[PDB]
């Protein structure tokens, strides 16, 4: 039972890592917008920012 759980967890980890490595490699670039709350009416703040992880 311990061996089977180790195998199951290793297979789940393999699935997750294979999925993660398959990500677009441009998925680390996302557009972000600080315009909630009182900054919504703020015009000195651009509509959106180019962030990169």
Ligand X SMILES: CC(C)CCC[C@@H](C)[C@H]1CC[C@H]2[C@@H]3CC=C4C[C@@H](O)CC[C@]4(C)[C@H]3CC[C@]12C
Ligand Y SMILES: CCCCCCCCCCCCCCCCCCCC(=O)O[C@H](COC(=O)CCCCCCCCCCCCCC)COP(=O)(O)OCCN
Contacts with ligand Y, residue ranges (CB under 6 A): 21-23, 25
Q: Which does 16 bind (CB under 5 to 8 A by kind): ligand X, its own copies, ligand Y, none?
A: ligand X
Cα Rg of the chain, angstroms? 20
Choosing from 1, 41, 47, 50, the residue that interacts with its own copies (CB under 8 A) is 41
Alpha-carbon distance of 46 to 34, in angstroms, equals 9
# binding residues, its own copies (CB under 8 A): 4
Q: Which does 44 bind (CB under 5 to 8 A by kind): ligand X, its own copies, ligand Y, none?
A: its own copies
Alpha-carbon distance of 37 to 16, in angstroms, equals 37
**Residue 7 in 3-state DSSP?**
helix
């Amino acid at each position: 039972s311990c061996r089977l759980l180790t195998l199951i967890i290793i297979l789940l980890a393999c699935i997750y890592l294979g999925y993660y490595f398959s990500l677009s490699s441009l998925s680390d670039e996302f557009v972000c917008s600080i315009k909630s709350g009182i900054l919504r009416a703020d015009s000195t703040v651009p509509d959106q920012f180019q962030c990169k992880l």
